Design a protein around this motif. Structure first.
Motif, PDB file in Angstrom:
ATOM      1  N   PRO A   1      12.451   4.470  22.132  1.00 13.07           N
ATOM      2  CA  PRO A   1      11.306   5.225  21.353  1.00 13.07           C
ATOM      3  C   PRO A   1      11.298   7.125  22.049  1.00 13.07           C
ATOM      4  N   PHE A   2      11.422   8.015  21.135  1.00 14.14           N
ATOM      5  CA  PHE A   2      11.493   9.614  21.637  1.00 14.14           C
ATOM      6  C   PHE A   2      11.061   9.734  20.404  1.00 14.14           C
ATOM      7  N   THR A   3      10.373  11.432  20.920  1.00 12.51           N
ATOM      8  CA  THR A   3       9.521  12.492  20.315  1.00 12.51           C
ATOM      9  C   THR A   3      10.468  12.695  19.220  1.00 12.51           C
ATOM     10  N   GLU A   4      11.617  12.376  18.377  1.00 11.76           N
ATOM     11  CA  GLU A   4      12.158  12.994  17.643  1.00 11.76           C
ATOM     12  C   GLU A   4      11.348  12.754  16.108  1.00 11.76           C
ATOM     13  N   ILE A   5      11.961  14.824  15.949  1.00 12.26           N
ATOM     14  CA  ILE A   5      11.058  15.054  14.333  1.00 12.26           C
ATOM     15  C   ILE A   5      12.229  15.106  13.306  1.00 12.26           C
ATOM     16  N   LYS A   6      13.290  15.019  14.055  1.00 13.85           N
ATOM     17  CA  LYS A   6      15.012  15.216  12.742  1.00 13.85           C
ATOM     18  C   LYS A   6      16.119  14.013  13.633  1.00 13.85           C
ATOM     19  N   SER A   7      16.972  13.933  13.260  1.00 10.09           N
ATOM     20  CA  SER A   7      18.107  13.978  13.688  1.00 10.09           C
ATOM     21  C   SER A   7      19.345  13.459  12.363  1.00 10.09           C
ATOM     22  N   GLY A   8      20.601  14.275  13.211  1.00  4.68           N
ATOM     23  CA  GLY A   8      21.670  13.792  12.433  1.00  4.68           C
ATOM     24  C   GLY A   8      22.852  14.681  12.695  1.00  4.68           C
ATOM     25  N   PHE A   9      23.725  14.561  11.733  1.00  3.13           N
ATOM     26  CA  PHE A   9      25.415  15.247  12.111  1.00  3.13           C
ATOM     27  C   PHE A   9      25.113  16.335  11.574  1.00  3.13           C
ATOM     28  N   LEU A  10      25.399  17.460  12.200  1.00  2.55           N
ATOM     29  CA  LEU A  10      26.224  19.215  11.932  1.00  2.55           C
ATOM     30  C   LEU A  10      27.085  19.487  12.668  1.00  2.55           C
ATOM     31  N   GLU A  11      27.958  20.645  11.436  1.00  2.00           N
ATOM     32  CA  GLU A  11      29.013  20.890  12.607  1.00  2.00           C
ATOM     33  C   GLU A  11      28.372  22.551  12.491  1.00  2.00           C
ATOM     34  N   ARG A  12      28.875  23.009  14.250  1.00  2.00           N
ATOM     35  CA  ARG A  12      28.465  24.377  14.647  1.00  2.00           C
ATOM     36  C   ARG A  12      29.673  25.345  14.700  1.00  2.00           C
ATOM     37  N   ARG A  13      30.177  25.631  13.844  1.00  2.00           N
ATOM     38  CA  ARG A  13      30.748  27.318  13.921  1.00  2.00           C
ATOM     39  C   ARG A  13      31.415  27.886  15.616  1.00  2.00           C
ATOM     40  N   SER A  14      32.217  27.317  16.482  1.00  2.00           N
ATOM     41  CA  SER A  14      32.683  27.880  17.479  1.00  2.00           C
ATOM     42  C   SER A  14      32.996  29.129  17.203  1.00  2.00           C
ATOM     43  N   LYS A  15      32.463  30.110  18.094  1.00  2.00           N
ATOM     44  CA  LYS A  15      32.690  31.542  18.354  1.00  2.00           C
ATOM     45  C   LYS A  15      33.809  32.132  18.397  1.00  2.00           C
ATOM     46  N   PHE A  16      34.921  31.513  19.373  1.00  2.00           N
ATOM     47  CA  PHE A  16      36.139  31.916  20.019  1.00  2.00           C
ATOM     48  C   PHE A  16      36.978  31.090  19.519  1.00  2.00           C
ATOM     49  N   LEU A  17      36.855  29.920  18.533  1.00  2.00           N
ATOM     50  CA  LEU A  17      37.817  29.072  18.952  1.00  2.00           C
ATOM     51  C   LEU A  17      38.698  29.133  17.408  1.00  2.00           C
ATOM     52  N   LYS A  18      37.546  29.358  16.185  1.00  2.00           N
ATOM     53  CA  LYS A  18      37.698  29.987  15.471  1.00  2.00           C
ATOM     54  C   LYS A  18      37.408  28.593  14.866  1.00  2.00           C
ATOM     55  N   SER A  19      36.964  27.611  15.117  1.00  2.00           N
ATOM     56  CA  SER A  19      36.750  26.617  14.357  1.00  2.00           C
ATOM     57  C   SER A  19      35.445  25.711  14.660  1.00  2.00           C
ATOM     58  N   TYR A  20      34.565  24.449  13.546  1.00  2.00           N
ATOM     59  CA  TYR A  20      33.422  23.716  13.459  1.00  2.00           C
ATOM     60  C   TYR A  20      33.890  22.635  14.589  1.00  2.00           C
ATOM     61  N   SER A  21      32.640  22.698  15.082  1.00  2.00           N
ATOM     62  CA  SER A  21      32.822  21.075  16.380  1.00  2.00           C
ATOM     63  C   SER A  21      31.531  20.775  15.520  1.00  2.00           C
ATOM     64  N   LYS A  22      32.071  19.172  14.642  1.00  2.97           N
ATOM     65  CA  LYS A  22      30.747  17.759  14.674  1.00  2.97           C
ATOM     66  C   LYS A  22      30.212  17.679  15.784  1.00  2.97           C
ATOM     67  N   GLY A  23      28.863  17.566  15.968  1.00  5.01           N
ATOM     68  CA  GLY A  23      28.107  16.797  17.201  1.00  5.01           C
ATOM     69  C   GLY A  23      26.793  16.042  16.096  1.00  5.01           C
ATOM     70  N   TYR A  24      26.155  15.292  17.100  1.00  3.18           N
ATOM     71  CA  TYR A  24      24.925  15.053  16.669  1.00  3.18           C
ATOM     72  C   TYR A  24      23.821  14.962  17.077  1.00  3.18           C
TER      73      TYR A  24
END
Length: 109
Positions: A1-24
């Motif tokens: 159990p968990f009070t999750e409203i939404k979950s899923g994979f997303l890519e966040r753009r790095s501020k310095f590395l000029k790349s995305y990193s996918k997280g859950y």
């Protein structure tokens, strides 16, 4: 159990590395949490937790349409601002819009 409203994979753009990193990502009434994997049984410590009380979602991509053809790249991005501006990229405009809307109603302040 968990009070999750939404979950899923997303890519966040790095501020310095000029790349995305996918997280859950897991959205709760309190935080947007980032995890490395989707295993909520064995991967239990967030790599990052963004407090919603001091975030806002500002802009998002305009869908690729005849009214505004988006030659450049994807149309599945949005900006989360901290009160600096994180750029997230979902799988599709539709998925992106679900994240945006769900974030919007938890961050009206």
């Amino acid at each position: 159990p968990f009070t999750e409203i939404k979950s899923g994979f997303l890519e966040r753009r790095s501020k310095f590395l000029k790349s995305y990193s996918k997280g859950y990502y897991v959205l709760t009434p309190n935080f947007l949490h980032e995890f490395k994997t989707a295993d909520r049984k064995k991967d239990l410590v967030p790599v990052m937790s963004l407090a919603l009380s001091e975030c806002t979602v500002t802009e998002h991509s305009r869908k690729n349409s005849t009214s505004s053809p988006n030659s450049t790249g994807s149309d599945a991005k949005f900006v989360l601002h901290a009160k600096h501006n994180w750029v997230f990229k979902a799988d599709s405009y539709e998925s992106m819009m679900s994240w945006f809307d769900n974030l919007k109603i938890l961050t009206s302040t």
